[PDB]
């Protein structure tokens, strides 16, 4: 996937790795190496009108 | 799964009415057909 990764203030439990929003999309994932929780925000999109 | 919460008062023996979620402790990857269960208590009667 693609998106901006930011340090999330989510209270991830020690046994939890992934994090989903109201839909089945990974909103946050724990780094497998440094054990850091990062938020997955989508890239900058939007509509265009002429 | 495991969970450890302290009760309020030593009232008559009964499960305290309340919602307490249990977080997983260990996930031992072992396969054995289990049909019976028995606890192990410490005698310590002296």
What features would you describe in this structure?
The structure is cut from a larger assembly and holds two copies of chain A. The first copy, chain A, has 50 residues and is mainly β. Chain A is built from no helices and four strands. The first copy, chain A, has strands at 4-7, 18-20, 26-30, 37-41. In chain A, a hairpin with a 5-residue loop joins strand 2 (18-20) and strand 3.
Which key terms come to mind for this protein?
part of a larger assembly, 2 chains, 50 residues, mainly beta, four-stranded antiparallel β-sheet, elongated, Spike protein S1 (chain A)
- Treating each run of at least 4 consecutive H or I residues as one helix, how many helices of chain A? 0
Whole-angstrom Rg of chain A: 13 Å
Oligomer: part of a larger assembly
The biggest sheet of chain A, with number of strands, parallel, antiparallel or mixed sense and barrel status, is:
4 strands, antiparallel
Give, in order, the helices and strands of chain A: EEEE
Side-by-side strand order of the widest sheet of chain A: 1-4-3-2
* Amount of helix of chain A: under 10%
Shape of chain A: elongated
Number of E-state strands of chain A: 4
How far apart are the first and last residues' alpha carbons of chain A, in Å? 30 Å
PDB class: viral protein
Keywords: SARS-COV-2, Spike, Antibody, viral protein
Entry title: SARS-CoV-2 Omicron 2-RBD up Spike trimer complexed with three XG005 molecules
Chains A, B: Spike glycoprotein
């Amino acid at each position: 996937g693609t998106g901006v990764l930011t340090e999330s203030n989510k209270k991830f439990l020690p046994f939890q790795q992934f994090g989903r929003d109201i839909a089945d999309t990974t909103d946050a994932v724990r780094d497998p190496q440094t054990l850091e929780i990062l938020d997955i925000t989508p890239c900058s999109f939007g509509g265009v009108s002429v | 799964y495991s969970k450890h919460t302290p009760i309020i008062v030593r009232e008559p023996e009964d499960l305290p009415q309340g919602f307490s979620a249990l977080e997983p402790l260990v996930d031992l990857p072992i396969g054995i057909n289990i049909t019976r269960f028995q606890t192990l208590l410490a005698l310590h009667r002296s």
